[PDB]
């Protein structure tokens, strides 16, 4: 799994054991970034990201790793932020073209598939490199309910009840399995998303961090919105008090 001349220098080159290492190294880039979490509840989807404070000279809400793709779709990114931002634009544009062509809001399953196909296109050629980021897409409606999809550098999309991507993604998933989610309201999910972030965050490794939350569901009438200052602070109190 570490052979010499070539094999891993190009995305257009298979290794003897049939692997595209350039895609796997782009996944290594997302594994080195901080954790992003998303839970699908009975009436919506909630996102959480441990935004790492690199310098105390940055403002609050700087380097948003939470995005609005469409008025009903949210995006939580992990990995190389520059590539994540450009993938948000593709996501936005595909969501924009759908409305202009057909009239209604793009279905999340269809939106995920179209963006995932775009990610995949960047894994076949020597002329381009794979995106070094994983991202999640959350939506809610009266007809379809809560839906959550995740897309990795390879171009694979899957539906999730709960999903984590980043530094301690496997450590976070063991904490998500403790939650019922299916019979939980999103009012109490924000509460839970907060603490899992505080648990997984390594205090001695990474010094300073800020918690970012967003949600889309019944409570927000189908729109993807930022979790208000009042609600975020109540959840962060639950995170620090359950630290005992």
């Amino acid at each position: 799994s570490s052979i010499g001349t070539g094999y891993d220098l190009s995305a257009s080159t298979f290794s003897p054991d049939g692997r595209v290492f350039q895609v796997e190294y782009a996944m290594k880039a997302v594994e080195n970034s901080s954790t992003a979490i998303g839970i699908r509840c009975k009436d919506g989807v909630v996102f959480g990201v441990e935004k790492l404070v690199l310098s105390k000279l940055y403002e609050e809400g700087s380097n948003k790793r939470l995005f609005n793709v469409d008025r009903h779709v949210g995006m939580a990114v992990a990995g190389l932020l520059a590539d994540a931002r450009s993938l948000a634009d593709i996501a936005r544009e595909e969501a924009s073209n759908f409305r202009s062509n057909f009239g209604y809001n793009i279905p999340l399953k269809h939106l995920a598939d179209r963006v995932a196909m775009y990610v995949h296109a960047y894994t076949l050629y020597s002329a381009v490199r794979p995106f070094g980021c994983s991202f999640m897409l959350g939506s809610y409606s009266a007809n379809d309910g809560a839906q959550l999809y995740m897309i990795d550098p390879s171009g694979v999309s899957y539906g999730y009840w709960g999903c984590a991507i980043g530094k301690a993604r496997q450590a976070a998933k063991t904490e998500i399995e403790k939650l019922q989610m299916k019979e939980m309201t999103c009012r109490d999910v924000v509460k839970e998303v907060a603490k899992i972030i505080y648990i997984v965050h390594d205090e001695v490794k990474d010094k300073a961090f800020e918690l970012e939350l967003s949600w889309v569901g019944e409570l927000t009438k189908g729109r993807h919105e930022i979790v208000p200052k009042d609600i975020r602070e109540e959840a962060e109190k639950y995170a620090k008090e359950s630290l005992k």
Binding site: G6, L9, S126, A127
Partner: protein
């Protein structure tokens, strides 16, 4: 991407084009192909490499191509690359006739193709055409002519020349027997059989192993004629009597 580029159109540290010189080595493997200029005409003599019992023989020739009403050429090197060039030669000849309403002069046809071969050596990143050509023809400007072409795009007019296998050994043999301004078609044909006999590693030389075409001026029009087996056998038997003339 730049790792897989073998840089075909690049100079060497010594100031020479590797892909051209390496292509020239490919010509030296191909069949022997010679040309001789005479006073009353001009001919080509080529070694046949398609010499199997099971071959059909459908075309009039293997190595000789008619290009024009007044012109013909022969080939040494990669046979497929030659098919590209000979087809292009016919187009150039027709372009000229369409515009000027007279046959293309020999030198003008040779330069036009050489411009193309030169191009493939300077830009594009593609491999050069692995072909050397010999051209025979007549025009109203210089009369009977013989031209040679390189993979580099280099050309030259010759009174007598040879290209292909044992090119060096053949050209020194022509350098001995050839008489400037004194060669007739009969004497040039006799020379052609002699040179091919020595350069042929199977020194029996049947008519099915060789190929000879003649270009003559006949009553106002040019006549290009490929000699058939009975004509060629008769030419070889004439040469074979000269081996029996040494017994004096």
């Amino acid at each position: 991407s730049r790792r897989y580029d073998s840089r075909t159109t690049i100079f060497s540290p010594e100031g020479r084009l590797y892909q051209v010189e390496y292509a020239m080595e490919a010509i030296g493997h191909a069949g022997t192909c010679l040309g001789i200029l005479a006073n009353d005409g001009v001919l080509l003599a080529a070694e046949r490499r398609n010499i199997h019992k099971l071959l059909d023989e459908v075309f009039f020739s293997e190595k000789i191509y008619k290009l024009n009403e007044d012109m013909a050429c022969s080939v040494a090197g990669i046979t497929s690359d030659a098919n590209v060039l000979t087809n292009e030669l016919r187009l150039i000849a027709q372009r000229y006739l369409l515009q000027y309403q007279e046959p293309i002069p020999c030198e003008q046809l040779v330069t036009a193709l050489c411009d193309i071969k030169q191009a493939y050596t300077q830009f594009g990143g593609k491999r050069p055409f692995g072909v050397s050509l010999l051209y025979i023809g007549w025009d109203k400007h210089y009369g009977f002519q013989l031209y040679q072409s390189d993979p580099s795009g280099n050309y030259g007019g010759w009174k007598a020349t040879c290209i292909g296998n044992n090119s060096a050994a053949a050209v020194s043999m022509l350098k001995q027997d050839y008489k400037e301004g004194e060669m007739t078609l009969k004497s040039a044909l006799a020379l052609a059989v002699k040179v091919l006999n020595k350069t042929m590693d199977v020194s029996k030389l049947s008519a099915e192993k060789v190929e000879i075409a003649t270009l003559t001026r006949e009553s106002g029009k040019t006549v290009i004629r490929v000699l058939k087996q009975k004509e060629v056998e008769q030419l070889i038997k004439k040469h074979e009597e000269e081996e029996a003339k040494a017994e004096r």
